[PDB]
Each structure stands twice: as structure tokens, then as C-alpha cells.
Symmetry: C4
Subunit: 31 residues, 4 copies
């Protein structure tokens, strides 16, 4: 069950995309 949990944490980790998307949006907005 600890494993299920850690599996859910890796699914949550699969956030950096969101960060990347945001950086890209700011730039498309003219910074």
C-alpha cells in the first residue's frame, strides 16, 4: 500500500510541464 502511494506520487510528478507551459505563456504574452 506504501507502493500504491508512491505510484500516485510519481503520477503527480509526471508539475514540470505546467512550469514549462507557464514560462512559455509569459513569453507568448510579451513577457
Amino acid at each position: 500500500r506504501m507502493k500504491q502511494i508512491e505510484d500516485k506520487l510519481e503520477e503527480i510528478l509526471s508539475x514540470y510541464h505546467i512550469e514549462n507551459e507557464l514560462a512559455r505563456i509569459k513569453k507568448l504574452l510579451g513577457e
Copy 2:
């Protein structure tokens, strides 16, 4: 406790919608 944990994680996972909404905004603002 551990079922509160698994449930809080399912509540958090239930984020990809956010990523996809951002993918849309980025697409909308992209070069015409």
C-alpha cells in the same frame, strides 16, 4: 490514516486538467 492519505492523493490527482487547460491557452496565444 493511510486511507486518508490515499484519498488526499486521489483528490490531488483528480493536475492533468490544469496542464491541458494551460496547453489550450498556450495554443490560443500561439502564432497565427
Copy 3:
């Protein structure tokens, strides 16, 4: 230590704001 963990999960929960902000941005963008 289970408590520490559940505390971190409530901190993560404190995401709906992000959703709200996004809905507001789409609307400000002219939908």
C-alpha cells in the same frame, strides 16, 4: 511520520486556487 506526510498533503491541497485562477484567465483572455 504518517502525520508529516498527511500534513504535506494538506499543504498541496491548500490546486483549487490554481483552477480558479485559470478559469479567470480564460475569461480575461476573451474566452
Copy 4:
């Protein structure tokens, strides 16, 4: 396992930056 867990959670928490970046975008796009 449990330290991998606590560490993955600290890696996730390390989100508020995202909220605040969105608060900025919303502020920028707000009525002049």
C-alpha cells in the same frame, strides 16, 4: 519507502510558485 515518499512530497511542494505565477498573469491581463 517512507523517505522516498516524504522526499517526493517535498519535490511536489517545492505548486505555490505556479499559483503565484498565475496570479501575475491574471493581474497583467486585468482591466487597465
